[PDB]
Design a protein around this ligand. Structure first.
Ligand code: MET
Ligand SMILES: [Cl-]
Ligand SMILES: [Cl-]
Ligand SMILES: [Fe+3]
Length: 178
């Protein structure tokens, strides 16, 4: 299924699991109900994978490239790192397919609590426009992720608070409107 839990309030290293024992799991249905989508895919065949190309069609993901997140490959690693884990939203959907390595994507639930989602090689997610999230690598310190977008991309992150944007209002309507 998926590896996801309500993460702890603990401060300290973000790249740690922040996964309390005992703790409450999180499933697919719950994430779906938050507008979040998920897929498992053959990460070796990505360069010519029908399933990937089917999803892209169905979702008009016309745009794609790859980011390799690690100290020696990504320029301004430490700054970029800090930016990702800042809580923010987007005015469009955020689509990552992890091709290699792994990391965590946290989102807030219907009661504004942090959910942590562990993403591995082969895992793909979509975080709907308007959802407050953040991202961090785990202690392996490496994530390679195909980024996807509907047409030409706009990367802008608006940190929290950003509750005035229409995308934010639309998403919060969507939650109440189940
Ligand atoms: C340069 S901030 C980019 C935000 C990105 N979608 C993330 O959640 O990590
Ligand atoms: Cl990014
Ligand atoms: Cl650097
Ligand atoms: Fe983001």
């Amino acid at each position: 299924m998926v590896q996801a839990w309500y993460m702890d309030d603990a401060p300290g290293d973000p790249r740690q699991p922040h996964r309390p024992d005992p703790g409450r799991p999180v499933g697919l249905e719950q994430l779906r109900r938050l507008g979040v989508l998920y897929w498992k895919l053959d990460a070796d065949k990505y360069e010519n994978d029908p399933e990937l190309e089917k999803i892209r069609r169905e979702r008009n993901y016309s745009w794609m490239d790859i980011i390799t997140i690690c100290k020696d490959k990504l320029p301004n690693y430490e700054e970029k790192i800090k930016m990702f884990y800042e809580e923010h939203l987007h005015l469009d959907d955020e689509i990552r397919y992890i091709l290699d390595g792994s990391g965590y994507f946290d989102v807030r639930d219907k009661e504004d609590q942090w959910i942590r989602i562990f993403m591995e090689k082969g895992d793909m997610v979509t975080l709907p426009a308007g959802i407050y999230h953040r991202f961090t690598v785990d202690e392996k310190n490496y994530t390679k992720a195909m980024r996807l977008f509907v047409g030409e991309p706009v990367w802008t992150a608006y940190n929290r608070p950003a509750d005035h944007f229409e995308a934010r209002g639309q998403y919060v309507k969507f939650l109440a409107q189940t």
